[PDB]
Design a protein around this nucleic acid. Structure first.
Ligand SMILES: [Mg+2]
Ligand SMILES: [Mg+2]
Ligand SMILES: [Mg+2]
Ligand SMILES: [Mg+2]
Ligand SMILES: [Mg+2]
Ligand SMILES: [Mg+2]
Ligand SMILES: [Mg+2]
Ligand SMILES: [Mg+2]
Ligand SMILES: [Mg+2]
Ligand SMILES: [Mg+2]
Ligand SMILES: [Mg+2]
Ligand SMILES: [Mg+2]
Ligand SMILES: [Mg+2]
Ligand SMILES: [Mg+2]
Ligand SMILES: [Mg+2]
Ligand SMILES: [Mg+2]
Ligand SMILES: [Mg+2]
Ligand SMILES: [Mg+2]
Ligand SMILES: [Mg+2]
Ligand SMILES: [Mg+2]
Ligand SMILES: [Mg+2]
Ligand SMILES: [Mg+2]
Ligand SMILES: [Mg+2]
Ligand SMILES: [Mg+2]
Ligand SMILES: [Mg+2]
Ligand SMILES: [Mg+2]
Ligand SMILES: [Mg+2]
Ligand SMILES: [Mg+2]
Ligand SMILES: [Mg+2]
Ligand SMILES: [Mg+2]
Ligand SMILES: [Mg+2]
Ligand SMILES: [Mg+2]
Ligand SMILES: [Mg+2]
Ligand SMILES: [Mg+2]
Ligand SMILES: [Mg+2]
Ligand SMILES: [Mg+2]
Ligand SMILES: [Mg+2]
Ligand SMILES: [Mg+2]
Ligand SMILES: [Mg+2]
Ligand SMILES: [Mg+2]
Ligand SMILES: [Mg+2]
Ligand SMILES: [Mg+2]
Ligand SMILES: [Mg+2]
Ligand SMILES: [Mg+2]
Ligand SMILES: [Mg+2]
Ligand SMILES: [Mg+2]
Ligand SMILES: [Mg+2]
Ligand SMILES: [Mg+2]
Ligand SMILES: [Mg+2]
Ligand SMILES: [Mg+2]
Ligand SMILES: [Mg+2]
Ligand SMILES: [Mg+2]
Ligand SMILES: [Mg+2]
Ligand SMILES: [Mg+2]
Ligand SMILES: [Mg+2]
Ligand SMILES: [Mg+2]
Ligand SMILES: [Mg+2]
Ligand SMILES: [Mg+2]
Ligand SMILES: [Mg+2]
Ligand SMILES: [Mg+2]
Ligand SMILES: [Mg+2]
Ligand SMILES: [Mg+2]
Ligand SMILES: [Mg+2]
Lengths: 178, 203, 260
RNA sequence: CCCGUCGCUACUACCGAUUGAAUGGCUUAGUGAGGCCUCCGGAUUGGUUUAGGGAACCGAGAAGCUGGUCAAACUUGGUCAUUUAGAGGAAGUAAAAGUCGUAACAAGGUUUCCGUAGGUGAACCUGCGGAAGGAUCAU
RNA sequence: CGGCACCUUACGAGAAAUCAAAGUCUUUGGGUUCUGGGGGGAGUAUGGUCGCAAGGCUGAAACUUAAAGGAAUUGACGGAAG
RNA sequence: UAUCUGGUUGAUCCUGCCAGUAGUCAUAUGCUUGUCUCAAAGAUUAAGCCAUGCAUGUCUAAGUAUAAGCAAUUUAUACAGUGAAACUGCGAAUGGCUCAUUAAAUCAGUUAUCGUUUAUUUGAUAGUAUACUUGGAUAACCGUGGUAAUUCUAGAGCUAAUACAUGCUUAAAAUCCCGACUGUUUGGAAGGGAUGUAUUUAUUAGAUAAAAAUUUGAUGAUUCAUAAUAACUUUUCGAAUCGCAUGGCCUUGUGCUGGCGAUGGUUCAUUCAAAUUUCUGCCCUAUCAACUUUCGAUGGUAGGAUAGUGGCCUACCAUGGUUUCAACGGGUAACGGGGAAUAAGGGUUCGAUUCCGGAGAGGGAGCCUGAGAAACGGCUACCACAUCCAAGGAAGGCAGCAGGCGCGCAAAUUACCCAAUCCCGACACGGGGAGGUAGUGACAAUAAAUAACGAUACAGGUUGUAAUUGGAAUGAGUACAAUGUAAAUACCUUAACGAGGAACAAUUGGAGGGCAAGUCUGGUGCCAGCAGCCGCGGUAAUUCCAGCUCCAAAAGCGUAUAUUAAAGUUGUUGCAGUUAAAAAGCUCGUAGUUGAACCUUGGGCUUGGCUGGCCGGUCCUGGACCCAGCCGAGCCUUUCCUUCUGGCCAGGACUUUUACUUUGAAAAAAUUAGAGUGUUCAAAGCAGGCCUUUGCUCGAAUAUAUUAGCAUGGAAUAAUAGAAUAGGACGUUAUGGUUCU
């Protein structure tokens, strides 16, 4: 038959289900960023856990090693590109110092709210899901869309959205049309 | 049917091997030709790759070489006198490779007398004496006699081979495989190989 | 099992064809021909995946049935014809001539050549021996048999085939200092000069090759193809990159400068 | 606190006359289909083809026949392996704390325990030799 | 020098009782043999093997169970002492 | 995240297990289920049994057309277009399925064929000592039929070939053999035979250390390639073929010549393969310690057979072969591997299943055809099942696709299509349940709705809510349409419709502890029940049954079983053995394991590179000098480091054996790790990007594999050998002697 298509899990659950310190930290972190559930926090921790694992393996290698220089610079470049890592912290030792709030800062939902396009973080998610927000000239309705540094300046209302110069929506057309 | 596979044997340690697969056609064997002496009967075999083998079931003649003289002639095969593998092949006159046979000596005698001018067997009987003079009195030109005279000195052959011509039958060993090629060919015994088989025959 | 295979699964195809996993279950099984299955490039892959002249396998057959495609100066209508190293592909309708030479990345480059160079090819001598009636002949790497060769030609030499008469123009003896391309192994596509040939009776002879950047590598003699009489003098045009292997960091630096 | 017979209930496994039963593998022996090779055979069917009516003599060739070879399968026997019946016998565990006593834990009222051998409703008792894990690190 | 032991201390070890080895063991590696893997069923059944026998050696499983056990502390009790 | 927590006691510290906890490309099941992408799926039990339908056929100008087929009159009265049926050719040996057997077997990596066969493809390759073109069959067809019945076929009458069977056409010489005659010092010769290529023998070439008294290829290696001689052969094949063009020369005769192709043909090479084959490596078991050898077990000689090697088989002959370094036997709920799950490291468990290899087609066995099959959508027979029958006979093989029964805890449509991927065929055109598309599908995986924002009113510390008041927003769904597609469906786009209880209503488990969240209310009263474990329940139950409230995860959540971590409770890393389980009663002892120290060290000189700087030489970056440091060298120190010829590369002659480690090559793709790349993000995929292109242009990296084998550097560590009755080493040109080429 046809070759199998690869797939993988993008999160991992905690080993201890009930822990007040972790439960309170997660809920506090979900409330700040308007997350739907704990899996959206597990996903960030999971992908951050493997960034650290890659950095740890390179840090065990000797300096000036060809693999450490090549993959280390590439890993740093990718994190700098999405704005998670600062431009003055390109050392692969600051990669280990990253925290989950650094990644949640770069979500589209967080950036819409912090750019003033929404009243609250929860207003940001519904604006995104309802096809009002466009990055560049492309409508993005994924709240977890990680905004790149070069995409930061091009976040705005979609040109065909009621809030961005489009026609009036379904509700208004029914009201002013009666 | 007949199979040449090594799976049915037990291993070098003596362990019986389990049945791995059904018999394959690329490991088959067939049955021996058991070539006899009689009017020629040859059957072809379609072998692997579409090739052809010839079962000589019966043959009368064969191509035999006189190694010392460098001459080959087609001659009748009289019978099998010795077989190093099985004595039952001698009893039943079965022609296989390396079988010691008696062949008609006339084609080689005719070549010898025409080539050298002398005679063979050296028997003293009346017919032998008459034939010896007949060859020596054959009508030849001056050049032919000189050509024969040049070949003289090399015309003296081994005693054990010359002696056989009196009986009109030479000892030979089959070199071809009659069941594989349909030919029953060989060479005339000479030297110490002939001496070896002479002891076997007289015993 | 009971006979020759006639299919080729997509995952089992040679990796240098650069076929995608999900386009289907099967891959073009190269026909029997001058080049081995693993070291060939079927014309269907070349005309559809490389040149993108044909959009699918139905169209490449339409192209070849109009007598457009020539391999080594002869019209081929077999869509899975196994074109290989040093073969010349001519499409006179587009007025294009290609030669199949490995690039340094291990794949068959799309290497366009002039019409004058498309009039010949190189072949590595595999064996020299006597045919029937005592006529010597040479077997090249692409299965060609040339009778009455120059008596100085031996194995591992390279001959220049006229490719229109099939005769030998001239040859290059295998010796130290000759220009070489590697046609097998992980050093496939690299170009350098022979530094030292290390013999191993009963085994595989090894050849030490020095790159133009003074990088030295070792490869089996069976993977060595003499392509020039000395350094910087190849008998065919080399593909872009000149068979010089760059490290991944060097390639990344080169790509950054090329794009700004 | 606690031990063991004995009595009731349930469950598990064991032994057990029945030359028990059933299923599967391997195999001796006997019989042996069929193909293949071989041996003749020669329905009919062409003339090397010759013949003043045609007698030949050349080839092809079906059924069938002879002897081999590979050998399915069956019958009998043996053996191995896996399930399973069984009068009766002897255990273990669980349940409840039913009967008899009080063996152990205090010097447990005869210190206890080990090996061995007898005896005895039951725990157990006794002999011989050990141990202290003793109730003595000592006169 | 070799032994049989003993006294003190605990650098050290140990759950502790205690230990000059039961130390040099998470700062984990001198060499090597044997044995154990919760309590019962059970050193039982079965097979083998040794034995005259008694028995020895080798040796399960089904099933059952939340503890059984080690060392020490306080108390209570003793047909133990003061 | 290299983690632990509850349970033995009146309390304590332990051993130790039980229980809790998390994952599973790990199965089942319960409850629940809105959207997008992706997608496993009758393996487990029964390689059990199967109704029905389909799954393998195939024609170009170029094998054979008098279809009494169609079509048109056309360059055509031999045929000529198209074209059923048949003959011929090829394929049907691929694919697809399944995992029963199978434990040095398969398989993996690594070898070999100087030990063989090979349709086809691709190159070469054939002047060989009636011909203006040979025969007689047969199909389709026509018309006589027989049987209940089949993809049954029989008489009779035709007729063809690239079918079948035969058969000529040719270079120039030259060489060899026999040899009447002749010359007559050994020459000349008329006339006869033989020459290509295959087959089968026998005998010869197939050389190759450098001066004095004519050739000869390859290999590490051959009796190799190849050639020659003498013969041999139920005599191999060296075109009686087919389409398009029709040209050139005149000696204008159906004159002689000739262009591009089809198909075929011998041998060699090549390719696709096949068959054997070297080395090393498999789970449990000793309640398996000896096994193999009648009747092949190990070896030798000869043969037979084979495509070929080989006890593969036969005859004769030896008595061997394996084994505590585990042979042999037994078990496997065992196809092997790439890989999968979990994992700090080391490991443990799994792998029927997308790729590779093997095996099988109900169980055995035997074969035909063919290059290739011991083939089963081929045949023959037996066994077991099983179908039709007019009772005489005939026909079977779903572990292919779909589907049915059965089995079970356990698994989908008797759907559409060759459009893609590819395969097959005489082939641009036909066929393909291979494959693709849709259906079913909570196997797993990705993204991701179930609301957002104001005003009042209050509470509250300039703003977070708690309520009753508004106007906005949107997709779930529905739909014109377009897109998508072979045609559709769906997705993506998008008119009109589509939200206040936004009833367009989120569930699954829990609330004593472990373990997050009640000492609320009602019911029962050691009952009913809960409770993985500890425990709760006998009239105010924080634990049962309910209501309220709350907690956890959420389109998912629980349960059962297996497995992994937790488990340093299998311990090599890394356990324990006085008393918790556990040092044999004590010695000896073979295999195994393990074994004291010691042999070139130090010194000196020159030099290359890279780190820091100083220099600074700064548009972070580059040079000698200087300092140190770190690696590599090369000579000299009494000096290992092979040795000669051409002259560090190429051509010879010698060499103690390992282990170890470095480097290199190899270890298929997929998978893993990982570089690049806005699939709208992501899982993925291997794409893509450029001012918008009658085109330009980065890519599709790279690591890891690891035992075995291969090449290589190093000589510590650990083995091994050497000169003790000297049978020892050097004499390069030491002195003779014996030989051999
Ligand atoms: Mg077995
Ligand atoms: Mg052949
Ligand atoms: Mg194979
Ligand atoms: Mg093809
Ligand atoms: Mg070799
Ligand atoms: Mg009976
Ligand atoms: Mg029998
Ligand atoms: Mg058994
Ligand atoms: Mg008492
Ligand atoms: Mg008393
Ligand atoms: Mg007492
Ligand atoms: Mg008593
Ligand atoms: Mg301590
Ligand atoms: Mg003490
Ligand atoms: Mg002591
Ligand atoms: Mg136990
Ligand atoms: Mg106690
Ligand atoms: Mg206790
Ligand atoms: Mg208590
Ligand atoms: Mg557990
Ligand atoms: Mg679980
Ligand atoms: Mg089914
Ligand atoms: Mg399946
Ligand atoms: Mg017609
Ligand atoms: Mg073909
Ligand atoms: Mg297959
Ligand atoms: Mg075994
Ligand atoms: Mg050819
Ligand atoms: Mg007829
Ligand atoms: Mg023919
Ligand atoms: Mg032999
Ligand atoms: Mg032999
Ligand atoms: Mg024998
Ligand atoms: Mg397995
Ligand atoms: Mg199995
Ligand atoms: Mg498998
Ligand atoms: Mg199975
Ligand atoms: Mg497979
Ligand atoms: Mg079946
Ligand atoms: Mg069958
Ligand atoms: Mg079969
Ligand atoms: Mg079938
Ligand atoms: Mg089949
Ligand atoms: Mg069917
Ligand atoms: Mg899902
Ligand atoms: Mg809802
Ligand atoms: Mg609820
Ligand atoms: Mg409940
Ligand atoms: Mg409740
Ligand atoms: Mg709590
Ligand atoms: Mg529960
Ligand atoms: Mg308790
Ligand atoms: Mg109450
Ligand atoms: Mg109550
Ligand atoms: Mg475990
Ligand atoms: Mg332990
Ligand atoms: Mg005790
Ligand atoms: Mg104990
Ligand atoms: Mg002791
Ligand atoms: Mg030592
Ligand atoms: Mg020189
Ligand atoms: Mg790989
Ligand atoms: Mg290795």
């Amino acid at each position: 038959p046809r070759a199998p298509r690869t797939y993988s899990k993008t999160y991992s659950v905690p080993k201890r289900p009930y822990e007040s310190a972790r439960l309170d930290a997660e809920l506090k972190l979900a409330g700040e960023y308007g997350l739907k559930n704990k899996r959206e926090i597990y996903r960030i921790g999971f992908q951050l856990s493997k960034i650290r694992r890659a950095a740890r393996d390179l840090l065990t290698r000797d300096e000036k090693d060809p693999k450490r220089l090549f993959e280390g610079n590439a890993l740093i470049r990718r994190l700098v590109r999405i704005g998670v890592l600062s431009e003055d912290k390109m050392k692969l030792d600051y990669v280990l110092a990253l925290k989950p709030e650094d990644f949640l800062e770069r979500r589209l939902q967080t950036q819409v709210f912090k750019l003033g396009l929404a009243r609250s973080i929860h207003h940001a998610r519904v604006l995104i899901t309802q096809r009002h927000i466009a990055v560049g000239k492309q409508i993005v309705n994924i709240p977890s869309f990680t905004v790149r540094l070069d995409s930061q300046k091009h976040i705005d209302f979609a040109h065909n959205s009621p809030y961005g110069g489009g026609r009036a929506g379904r509700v208004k057309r029914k009201n002013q049309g009666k | 049917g007949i199979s040449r596979d090594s799976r049915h044997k037990r291993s070098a340690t003596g362990a019986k091997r389990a049945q791995f697969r059904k018999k394959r056609k690329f490991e088959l064997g067939r049955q021996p030709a058991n070539t006899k002496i009689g009017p020629k009967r040859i059957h072809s075999v379609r072998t692997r790759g579409g090739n052809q083998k010839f079962r000589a079931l019966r043959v009368e003649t064969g191509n035999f070489s006189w190694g010392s003289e460098g001459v080959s002639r087609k001659t009748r095969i009289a019978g099998v006198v010795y077989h190093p593998s099985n004595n039952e092949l001698v009893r039943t006159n079965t022609l296989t490779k390396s079988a010691v046979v008696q062949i008609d000596a006339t084609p080689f005698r005719q070549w010898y007398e025409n080539h050298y001018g002398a005679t063979l067997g050296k028997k003293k009987g009346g017919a032998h004496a008459a034939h010896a003079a007949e060859v020596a009195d054959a009508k030849r030109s001056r050049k032919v006699e000189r050509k024969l005279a040049a070949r003289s000195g090399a015309a003296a052959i081994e005693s054990a081979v010359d002696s056989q011509f009196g009986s009109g039958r030479l000892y030979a060993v089959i070199s071809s495989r009659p069941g594989q090629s349909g030919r029953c060919d060989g060479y005339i015994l000479e030297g110490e190989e002939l001496a070896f088989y002479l002891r076997r025959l007289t015993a | 099992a009971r006979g020759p295979k006639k299919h080729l699964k997509r995952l089992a195809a040679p990796s240098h064809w650069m076929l995608d996993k999900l386009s289907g279950t099967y891959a073009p099984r190269p026909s029997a021909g001058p080049h081995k299955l693993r070291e060939s490039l079927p014309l269907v892959v070349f005309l559809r995946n490389r040149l993108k002249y044909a959009l699918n396998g139905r169209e490449v057959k339409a192209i070849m049935m109009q007598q457009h495609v020539q391999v080594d100066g002869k019209v081929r209508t077999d869509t899975t014809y196994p074109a290989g190293f040093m073969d010349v592909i001519t499409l006179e309708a587009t007025n294009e001539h290609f030669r199949l030479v490995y690039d340094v990345k291990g794949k068959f480059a799309v290497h366009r050549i002039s019409a004058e160079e498309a009039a010949y090819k190189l072949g590595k001598v595999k064996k020299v021996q006597l045919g029937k009636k005592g006529v010597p002949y040479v077997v090249t790497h692409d299965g060609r048999t040339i009778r009455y060769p120059d008596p100085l030609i031996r194995a591992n030499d390279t001959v220049k085939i006229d490719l229109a008469t099939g005769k030998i123009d001239d040859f290059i003896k295998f010796d130290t200092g000759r220009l070489v391309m590697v046609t097998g192994g992980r050093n496939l596509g690299r170009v350098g000069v022979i530094v030292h040939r290390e013999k191993h009776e009963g085994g595989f002879d090894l050849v030490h090759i020095k790159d133009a950047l003074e990088n030295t590598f070792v490869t089996r003699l069976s993977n060595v193809f003499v392509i020039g009489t000395e350094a910087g003098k190849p008998w065919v045009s080399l593909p872009k990159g000149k068979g010089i292997k760059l490290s991944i960091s060097e390639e990344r630096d080169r790509r950054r400068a090329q794009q700004g």
